[PDB]
């Protein structure tokens, strides 16, 4: 994936590389003007052996963002994109 910032005048948008996690292993929640991204997968075999992973990632939003309009989606390449319209 790609972990970059892609803000514009009309959209707050960030991307995050989470290629080790499946769609059902990720959650995005917005509270108190903060986006919280959580990932967790059980012990499974990869190219090196058995591994389990967990992480919590937080972004700070600009004031006035409506949390009910935050969109998130995962690409087949493992890039999670979170975006929202600017006030």
């Amino acid at each position: 994936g790609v972990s970059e910032i892609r803000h514009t005048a009309d959209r707050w948008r960030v991307s995050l590389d989470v290629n080790h996690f499946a769609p059902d292993e990720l959650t995005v929640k917005t509270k108190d003007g903060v986006v919280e991204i959580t990932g967790k997968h059980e012990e499974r075999q990869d190219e090196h052996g058995y591994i389990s992973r967990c992480f919590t990632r937080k972004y700070t939003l600009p004031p006035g963002v409506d949390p009910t309009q935050v969109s998130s989606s995962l690409s087949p390449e493992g890039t999670l994109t979170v975006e929202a319209p600017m006030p």
């Binding site: 989470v18 290629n19 499946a22 690409s75």
Partner: peptide, 4 residues
């Protein structure tokens, strides 16, 4: 499976 996962992404990649």
């Amino acid at each position: 499976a996962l992404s990649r």
